[model samples]
Target: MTVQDYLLKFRKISSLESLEKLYDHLNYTLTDDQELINMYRAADHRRAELVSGGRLF
Candidate 1:
């Protein structure tokens, strides 16, 4: 149940291209430190989403 909740949460933004959009935004500008953290968070969150959905394990 919790995993599905998380999956939906991540899926809201896990539409793919946006993932790199955020990443490129990070690489292009070093102004927002918080965005940097957010980028990592989203990256790892996506990883978690995959595992949570049993796509990995």
Candidate 2:
């Protein structure tokens, strides 16, 4: 799939589980995509909050 297509999928992720599944797929398929990696980091951080309900404290 195209980078835009992958990104469209990424934008729809609302859970950490979904994010990891997509992240692994892209990591293997788009190893050279720096942009995807950058977005993944931000998305991972964001999803963690929604899943874990924010900080431990």
Highest-TM-score candidate: 1
Q: Where is the poorest 10-residue window by lDDT in model 2?
A: 1-10
At residue 8, candidate 2 shows an lDDT of 62
**Per-residue C-alpha lDDT of model 1 across residues 1-57, encoded as one tens digit per residue:** 434322344347856677787677655787566556666777778777766876532
Residue-by-residue lDDT tens digits, candidate 2, 1-57:
434545566666765676667667667776666647656665866766566775554
Looking at model 2, residue 40 earns an lDDT score of 62
Return the TM-score for each candidate structure: 0.52, 0.49
Q: Candidate 1 at residue 33, lDDT?
A: 65
C-alpha RMSD (angstroms) for model 1: 7.2
